[PDB]
Design a protein around this ligand. Structure first.
Ligand SMILES: Nc1ncnc2c1ncn2[C@@H]1O[C@H](COP(=O)(O)OP(=O)(O)OP(=O)(O)O)[C@@H](O)[C@H]1O
Ligand SMILES: Nc1ncnc2c1ncn2[C@@H]1O[C@H](COP(=O)(O)OP(=O)(O)OP(=O)(O)O)[C@@H](O)[C@H]1O
Ligand SMILES: [Mg+2]
Ligand SMILES: [Mg+2]
Lengths: 562, 564
């Protein structure tokens, strides 16, 4: 695989060294059995006690030496291939912060968990154990069978019968499970998706459908059907391989052809000593690749799947390369190919002016804020902050110049202080409190059990109108020259909405503000009201001018009073 | 293991008993298979090798019987492995909807998500991969050890002592890495939680410049995960080499004893050579146990998380069916009190709502007016007092009858990853297509079908993230209107809707065909138009109530509420 081999290229030299050292280790491990054959052959000859003991000691030391060298490789090779995962996982988290957010919405948090954590974990066998198991599974059976074939070819061929049978089981097991292993990561993502949706959308599951009718139960039963149909012949072949390559199976097969040769005048019993001691040793090494070839397939797919993400197009910062000004110049954007969401929008936001972006729901007013944030790149046109294109501005220079409220109270799992101080985590606790008071949420937070240190994860959340005020306080603390309020105070009552509106007007007197609102009664004081219908700006002007013009804004205003 | 056996289905315990017999039979045949070699080889190297034919016969018979048992023990081990898996995962899936909402703390949701995430094949083979080699290698090396007492007592006693030290070494390996594997699991679990947050709240993090690994919270989770990951290997591999080496030290030791007894004349040379060969059967079972320490701890961890979910506090319930099965029930509170942890939400809240009429709830944010709709729907339950649906206490209602008596439009509308029509159909999957279009048409979802390319097949993202804020709100409204329940709870269903769609939706909510008892929460006066009754809640208590016109004329807090 071009993408699979390209990912694991840095581990070329460590893996080649692992293969060579395993060749030496496997020969060191077979060495004491050859000495035991000589020691056993000396017992028949009745040699002196000292002669037998020297073969015993040099066999014990080689057992110790082989174990030291074997443990030196595995300890080294796991550290090398655990640092690779940390390097690889750091690359993914760096990659994901640069992709457009269309990537995140079409995959979700369940597939990103699969990528960063599960897929990088699936590489573990492919690098730590694949080459040691592949080299030991060929060095030792070939080394033994070459030794035993010189000893006696008759019993060597008999011992070779289970070798061929094991290869047949290994091949049919691998090809049959090949199709299922390809489908396995897909099911894990989908099952991971339902588990996230089932646990997150619990109020929906409880009231609508309940436990029985939930889609999680349906797909859970479907997944276990996949595992049963996958793991049934897989485990069925794995047990047969374990029986064929068991030490007792070789020892029986040796004696099936050994006893008739010893009983008849066709083999001296001394020539069985190599088989009884060496013939059974390589059963557990052949089994290493039988159980591994499935683990290589998951690793190679995971490497292919990881490298594909690392080759995704990014939000590249161009090399091309008034304060507080944002300009949209014939912007046009499409979330999907051939589905225009924004069409030829031209809009200039100047300092000290509050621009009010209104219109029908689903018109495109939130995606315009997304384009300004550069969560997505405009398909046409350009967006320029202070004369610098957002595509030329780096992430720091862009998000230090523009601050956002995103219509969703996306609170992080952390203290109340940290959710307010997400922009600048080293913000002083007094600065956090002043931001919270401006959002009219300091009084709420003081009443919580732990104050500003209280955790705001799932099951310890706030009310819907208060989790939004936390994000308003976050934006206030960030305090960028350009602010983009995507329907802040949607869930706020009139009293709190008016108070936070007064606070924001106090804060952003000499700043650019793009306020998005469906409550038009708070929009009447905007310097310019921009009406966005079907992604195109259909009319621009002040409140009185729009009412006099009598268009879509007049329709919305009349329908507002009901 | 005691937690493991109880998770089996009651019907499957017959296979559990059969599995134990074949597991004892398999070990007994394997030990007997090793015993039959000593007469065989000792006869083979003797002057009359023809005696080997008899002892070869019993070895082949025991060997074939060993293969038959081992294949069948795998089939029962496979069946028991998935019987536990399918039973536990179905029990967890059926248990979580009934578990109390307060149980889902950020840590508990992590274990519940991890416990659900253990559905893969690693836990499916908890019997075949882990128990069978473990039990086979706990009884067989001792079975060979006791069998050697009838050939040489010093060698047979050494074999039994070998099992003692080898298992003792395994215990020390587990005790050493138990602390490190506790930290490894927690830091590996926290990394999963932060990846979910990283990909779920990406918009908030990016605007906050909190996405680089050098400053992100997932970056710290990865760094902590790596440190605990390496620290586990440092305290784990020395455990495995000591066990693996001690296994080889024990084997060569006994092969040394067999030689040494031969030198002293206590053991014949043919019998000594037979014992040297057969003693590989002593280390064969212990070889499998060497690498199962990581598997044993992971399997122990998952079964603890599974049992944690099955120990979760199920919500209280009864078996009373709703009296007004068809008609509109009369919702009422009787000194209903409620509190999240320590903070008091409701204190002395008592109101009675007539059947079939529409009632509005208004008040400052944080008042507790989403909690009122939660208690009526049964998502929450009072600490004291009782909610009555037509004189029937909700706590005593059958949970099947409890959910069928309420439909809710949640404040933060959540949709599942799937087509637009699928999310509308979860309200009533048995509904006729005419009823689905009627609900979508009423909730103004037909506007989305006209605009969107796919119509009612647009693949919504996780939540409603592949739809606008008002598009997922109208899909939520259509979902609730489709459900035929005689109670409709509306929790700010017009927040993210323009004046054009808000006015139309408000008409649909208050003028749908069938009768219902409608409770409405909203922060916009146009969203509670022509409502029969109002409930103003400020401090968690209903300050005042009545008609809209009466309250406006009265000039109380309701009049000041919309003054601005
Ligand atoms: N899961 C929770 N854990 C702890 N406290 C909570 C939880 N949910 C809500 N609260 C607290 O309950 C009180 C009332 O919450 P509730 O959701 O009922 O508010 P609400 O009146 O509907 O407000 P909003 O206008 O913001 O929607 C608030 O103080 C909120 O902090
Ligand atoms: N991730 C996405 N993939 C595809 N289409 C999307 C995605 N996000 C939004 N859309 C589409 O973009 C169009 C406009 O969405 P947007 O979020 O800009 O709405 P909006 O005008 O802000 O609405 P509202 O006032 O209800 O919040 C909608 O038709 C929605 O279907
Ligand atoms: Mg929007
Ligand atoms: Mg609420």
């Amino acid at each position: 695989a071009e993408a699979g081999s390209r990912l694991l290229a840095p581990l070329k030299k460590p893996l080649i060294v692992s293969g060579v050292l395993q060749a030496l280790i496997t020969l060191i491990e077979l060495a004491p059995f050859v000495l035991l054959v000589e020691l056993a052959r000396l017992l028949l000859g009745g040699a002196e006690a000292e002669r037998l003991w020297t073969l015993g000691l040099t066999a014990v030391s080689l057992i110790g030496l082989g174990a030291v060298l074997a443990a030196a490789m595995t300890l080294w090779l796991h550290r090398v291939d655990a640092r690779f995962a940390h390097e690889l996982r750091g690359r993914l988290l760096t990659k994901l912060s640069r992709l457009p957010l269309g990537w995140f919405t079409r995959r979700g948090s369940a597939s990103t968990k699969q990528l960063v954590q599960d897929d990088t974990l699936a590489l573990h066998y492919l690098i730590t154990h694949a080459i040691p198991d592949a080299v030991a599974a060929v060095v030792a059976p070939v080394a033994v069978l070459v030794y035993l074939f010189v000893a006696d070819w008759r019993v060597a061929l008999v011992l070779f019968i289970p070798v061929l049978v094991y290869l047949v089981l290994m091949s049919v097991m691998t090809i049959q499970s090949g199709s299922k292993i390809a489908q396995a990561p897909r099911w894990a993502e989908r099952m991971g998706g339902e588990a996230g949706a089932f646990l997150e959308g619990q109020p929906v599951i409880r009231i609508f459908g309940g436990a029985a009718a939930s889609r999680f139960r349906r797909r859970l039963d479907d997944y276990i059907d996949f595992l049963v149909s996958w793991q049934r012949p897989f485990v069925g072949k794995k047990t047969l391989m374990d029986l064929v390559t068991r030490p007792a199976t070789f020892l029986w097969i040796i004696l099936v052809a050994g006893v008739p040769l010893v009983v008849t005048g066709r083999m001296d019993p001394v020539n069985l000593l190599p088989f009884l001691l060496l013939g059974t040793t390589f059963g557990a090494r052949l089994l290493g690749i039988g159980y591994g070839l499935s683990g290589i397939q998951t690793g190679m797919l995971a490497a292919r799947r990881i490298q594909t993400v690392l080759d995704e197009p990014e939000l590249v910062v161009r090399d091309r390369t008034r304060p507080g000004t944002v300009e949209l110049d014939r912007v046009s954007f499409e979330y999907r190919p051939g589905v225009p969401v924004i069409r030829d929008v031209t809009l200039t936001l100047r300092p000290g002016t509050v621009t009010a972006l209104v219109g029908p729901s689903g018109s495109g007013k939130s995606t315009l804020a997304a384009l300004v944030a550069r969560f997505h790149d405009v398909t046409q046109g350009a967006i320029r902050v202070d004369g610098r294109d957002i595509r030329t501005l780096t992430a720091d220079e862009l998000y230090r110049r523009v601050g956002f409220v995103l219509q969703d109270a996306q609170l992080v799992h952390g203290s109340v202080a940290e959710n307010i101080a997400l922009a600048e985590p080293d913000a002083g606790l007094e600065r956090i409190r002043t931001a919270a008071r401006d959002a009219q949420i300091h009084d709420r937070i003081t009443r919580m059990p732990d104050g500003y240190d209280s955790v705001l994860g799932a099951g310890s959340a706030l009310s819907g109108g208060e989790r939004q005020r936390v994000t308003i306080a976050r934006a206030i603390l960030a305090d960028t020259p350009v602010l983009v309020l995507d329907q802040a105070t949607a869930f706020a009552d009139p009293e709190s909405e008016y108070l936070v509106q007064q606070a924001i007007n106090r804060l952003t007197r000499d700043r650019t503000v793009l306020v998005i609102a469906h409550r038009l009664h708070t929009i009447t004081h905007a310097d310019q009201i921009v009406v966005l219908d079907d992604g195109r700006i259909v009319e621009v002007g002040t409140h009185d001018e729009l009412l006099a013009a009598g268009g879509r804004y007049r329709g919305l205003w009349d329908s507002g009073r009901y | 293991i005691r937690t493991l056996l109880r998770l089996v289905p009651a019907e499957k315990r017959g296979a559990v008993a059969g599995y134990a017999v074949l597991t004892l039979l398999s070990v007994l045949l394997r030990a007997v298979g090793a015993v039959l070699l000593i007469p065989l080889l000792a006869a083979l190297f003797s002057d009359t090798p023809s005696d080997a034919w008899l002892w070869l016969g019993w070895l082949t018979a025991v060997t074939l019987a060993g293969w038959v048992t081992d294949t069948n023990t795998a089939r029962l081990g496979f069946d028991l492995g998935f019987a536990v898996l399918s039973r536990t995962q179905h029990d967890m899936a059926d248990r979580l909807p009934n578990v109390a909402m307060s149980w889902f703390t950020p840590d508990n949701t992590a274990t519940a998500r991890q416990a659900i995430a253990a559905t893969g094949p690693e836990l499916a083979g908890l019997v075949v991969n882990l128990l069978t080699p473990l039990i086979g290698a706990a009884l067989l090396p001792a079975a060979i050890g006791v069998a050697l007492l009838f050939v040489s007592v010093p060698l047979g006693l050494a074999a039994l002592a070998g099992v003692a030290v080898l298992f003792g070494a395994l215990a020390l390996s587990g005790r050493l890495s138990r602390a490190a594997d506790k930290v490894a699991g927690e830091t590996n679990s926290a990394f999963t939680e932060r990846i979910i947050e990283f990909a779920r709240t990406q918009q908030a993090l990016r605007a906050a410049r909190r996405v680089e690994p050098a400053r992100s919270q997932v970056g710290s989770a990865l760094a902590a995960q790596h440190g605990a990951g390496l620290r586990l290997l440092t305290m784990q591999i020395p455990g495995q080499v000591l066990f693996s080496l001690a296994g080889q030290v024990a084997l060569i030791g006994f092969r040394g004893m067999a030689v040494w007894l031969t030198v002293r004349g206590q053991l014949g040379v043919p019998e000594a050579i037979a014992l040297i060969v057969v003693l590989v059967r002593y280390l064969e079972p212990f070889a499998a146990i060497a690498d199962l320490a990581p598997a044993l701890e992971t399997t122990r961890a998952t079964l603890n998380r599974i049992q944690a979910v099955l120990d979760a506090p199920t919500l209280p319930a009864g078996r009373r069916r709703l009296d007004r099965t068809g008609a509109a029930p009369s919702i009422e509170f009787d000194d209903v009190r409620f509190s999240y942890g320590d903070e008091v939400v409701l204190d002395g809240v008592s109101f009675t709502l007539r059947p079939g009429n529409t009632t509005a709830i208004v008040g400052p944010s944080g008042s507790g007016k989403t909690t009122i709709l939660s208690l009526i729907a049964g998502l929450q339950q009072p600490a004291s007092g009782r909610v009555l649906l037509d004189g029937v206490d909700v706590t005593t209602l059958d949970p099947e009858a409890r959910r069928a008596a309420v439909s809710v439009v949640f404040q933060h509308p959540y949709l599942f990853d799937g087509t637009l029509r699928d999310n509308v159909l979860v309200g009533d999957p048995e509904a006729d297509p005419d009823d689905v279009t009627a609900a979508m048409r009423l909730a103004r979802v037909d506007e989305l079908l006209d605009r969107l390319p796919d119509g009612d097949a647009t693949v919504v993202g996780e939540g409603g993230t592949a739809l606008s804020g008002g598009e997922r709100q109208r899909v939520s409204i259509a979902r609730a209107l489709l459900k035929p329940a005689p109670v409709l709870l509306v929790d700010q269903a017009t927040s993210a809707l323009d004046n054009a769609n808000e006015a139309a939706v408000v008409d649909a909510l208050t003028a749908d065909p069938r009768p219902r008892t409608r409770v409405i929460v909203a922060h916009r006066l146009a969203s509670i138009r022509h409502a029969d009754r109002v409930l103003f809640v400020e401090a968690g208590r209903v300050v005042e109530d009545g008609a809209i016109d009466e309250l406006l004329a009265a000039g109380g807090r309701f009049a000041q509420f919309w003054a601005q």
